[PDB]
Amino acid sequence: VPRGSHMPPRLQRFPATASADEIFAAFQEDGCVVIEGFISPEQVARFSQEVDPAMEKIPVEVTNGNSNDRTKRFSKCVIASPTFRNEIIESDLMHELCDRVFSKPGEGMGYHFNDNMVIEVQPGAPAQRLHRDQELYPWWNSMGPAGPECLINFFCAVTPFTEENGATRLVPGSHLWPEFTQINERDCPQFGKIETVPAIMQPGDCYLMSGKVIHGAGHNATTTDRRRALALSIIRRELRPVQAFSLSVPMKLAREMSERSQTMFGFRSSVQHCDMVHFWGNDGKDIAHHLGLIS
Amino acid sequence: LVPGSHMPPRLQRFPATASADEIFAAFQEDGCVVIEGFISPEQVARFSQEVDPAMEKIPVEVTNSNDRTKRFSKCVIASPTFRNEIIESDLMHELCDRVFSKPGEGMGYHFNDNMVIEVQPGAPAQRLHRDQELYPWWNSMGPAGPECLINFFCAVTPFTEENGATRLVPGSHLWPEFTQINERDCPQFGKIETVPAIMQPGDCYLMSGKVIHGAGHNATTTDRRRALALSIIRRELRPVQAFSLSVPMKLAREMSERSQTMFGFRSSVQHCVDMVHFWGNDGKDIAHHLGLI
Ligand SMILES: C=C1[C@@]2(C)C[C@H]3[C@]4(C)CC[C@@H](O)C(C)(C)[C@H]4CC[C@]3(C)[C@]1(C(=O)OC)C(=O)[C@@](C)(O)C2=O
Ligand SMILES: C=C1[C@@]2(C)C[C@H]3[C@]4(C)CC[C@@H](O)C(C)(C)[C@H]4CC[C@]3(C)[C@]1(C(=O)OC)C(=O)[C@@](C)(O)C2=O
Ligand SMILES: O=C(O)CCC(=O)C(=O)O
Ligand SMILES: O=C(O)CCC(=O)C(=O)O
Ligand SMILES: [Fe+3]
Ligand SMILES: [Fe+3]
């Protein structure tokens, strides 16, 4: 920023080799932070090829205002992609960051997966409605910035992110506004005056975003760029996933998963303390016994 | 009644033939209400007999809210009366919708648990607690918070003050600050007047996640005090039981669609301009992949 200019909201950046407490401090202060090279170079390539057939079989709606107008969405990444199920979801850093946002000492893994979405904003797609992802859990806004974190997003780029192909518009620091509202002219005072920043990103980068950060896919201005992303939506264990992964992901794949990844997809329980109780358990036991996964 | 005797809080009681609006009005005022005859005596007695082998095989722990209390949750597997008729209580669904379901979204609730709770002779009293402490952030929203959880807590065997009927605190869903009930955080600690849910078999009380309560002390030598807790949460919250993974598909196929939704064999659509199936499969109902039409 040239001297005397207005400084736009800060969007720090870290290489995927940086410390967890470091990237977390940026997450805490600004609600978001980029992690360049979150997934390896060829890894993202091997992922993008693997889901390209499934993407290719998704028609595009040309409608209207909603978040599906010229935007393809696809969630069966575990089924359709070995690289994702074998490599990406086993990022030690990802878990290291989920432990800081969600887990409490002695209570095990405090988080699990909400969704695994590939989102490909088609050329000419209108800008997505501005929103907090925690609107998925409607009461959460009511708790304001003091509320605990329900949701974080590792929002990784598949094809590159530019200002023109509709990369995500971020509003850093909107996690600390004093009243969390929906973002429209009737409910949001600051509507029309919201300073957004685009998340310019190369394939394999990601931004870790809080469910409190206002954001949205921008308008894709191009004519050939299908702007593709991979969203790793991770929630606290007490919240329900939008994807019923433990009913769609075949048991064969769950047997190949780690313990922690079995916990992420609901093939394994976790114990909550208050008295104690396995959430998503089976009459006082881990659901994994009944599924043939303890041995 | 009593003789200038201090009068205890009133737990309102309605027969199961009362209008769901009259029971919901009581529930809103007090946070709890008794539904007499929520289940028929014939239904209760078949249920109790159908789970009873499973109850006998459960070792009593003697030493914590599991102290001399049996807790059994495979009600759907062990009991046809449960899955074929207790689950199909229309008054239960009337009341659940009035609490949880939003306009134009389908069912906004599902099952958290189906727990048989048999308080043994001599079992000590349970700590005072709100059931929404299961979702730890919920107390922070206070009494203006939305409902997260309700309990249809049914007497399977009689509930008496001696054998440990639940102690309830009506209107504790309206206190300005929702706190955990200990000496550090709860200013009223020790000073809280509870009342027991005196119930006959098949009766039940409907209770908010926001009401303070605990199982009473079982001061008898003979009464094993058996209850059935139908714990119902809203659709965005995680169940304590993984029913869709343990309940067999053969039993899912025989369920009504609203029962399939209760146990996670079927999705429900939430609206935010946008629409998403909660607990879905790549934009489609999970009931498709499961073969439930
Ligand atoms: C761990 C416990 C938790 C936190 C949650 C409950 C809870 C899921 C709360 C909601 C209810 O609708 C119902 C009946 C389904 C219970 C069953 C018993 C447990 C699982 C619990 C327990 O089993 O304690 C050894 C408790 O007794 C208790 C009361 O103290 C708790 O509040
Ligand atoms: C219905 C929608 C909901 C309500 C919820 C999200 C949500 C599950 C929220 C949490 C995120 O981590 C992520 C990326 C996984 C998305 C995926 C897209 C949808 C499912 C949604 C959508 O697909 O719109 C027809 C939207 O785009 C949106 C933003 O507008 C919504 O708020
Ligand atoms: O497509 C994008 O860039 C953002 C996706 C998103 O924010 C959502 O669907 O919740
Ligand atoms: O068994 C009772 O009467 C009380 C049980 C209860 O409130 C609980 O475990 O949450
Ligand atoms: Fe979003
Ligand atoms: Fe309770």
Author numbering:
A (entry chain B): -1 to 61, 63 to 273, 276 to 296
B (entry chain A): -2 to 0, 2 to 61, 65 to 273, 275 to 295
Text taken from the publication that reported this structure:
AusE (Mr 35,100 protein, 314 amino acids) and PrhA (Mr 35,121 protein, 314 amino acids) are very similar (~78% amino acid sequence identity) αKG oxygenases that both accept preaustinoid A1 (5) as a substrate to form divergent products through dynamic skeletal rearrangement. AusE first desaturates at C1–C2 to form preaustinoid A2 (6), followed by rearrangement leading to the formation of the spiro-lactone in preaustinoid A3 (7). In contrast, PrhA first desaturates at C5–C6 to form berkeleyone B, followed by rearrangement of the A/B-ring to form the cycloheptadiene moiety in berkeleydione.
To understand the structural basis for the expanded catalytic functions of the PrhA mutants, we also solved the X-ray crystal structures of PrhA-V150L/A232S mutant in complex with Fe(II), αKG, and its substrate (3, 5, 6, or 7) at 2.25–2.3 Å resolution, as well as PrhA-V150L/A232S/M241V mutant in complex with Fe(II), αKG, and 3 at 2.35 Å resolution. PrhA-V150L/A232S/M241V mutant also catalyzes the same rearrangement reaction as AusE and generates 13 as well as two additional products 15 and 16. In the complex structures of PrhA-V150L/A232S and PrhA-V150L/A232S/M241V with berkeleyone A, both H-3 and H-5 are well oriented to react with the reactive ferry intermediate. Moreover, the M241V mutation is thought to provide additional space around C-13 to allow further oxidation to generate 13–16.
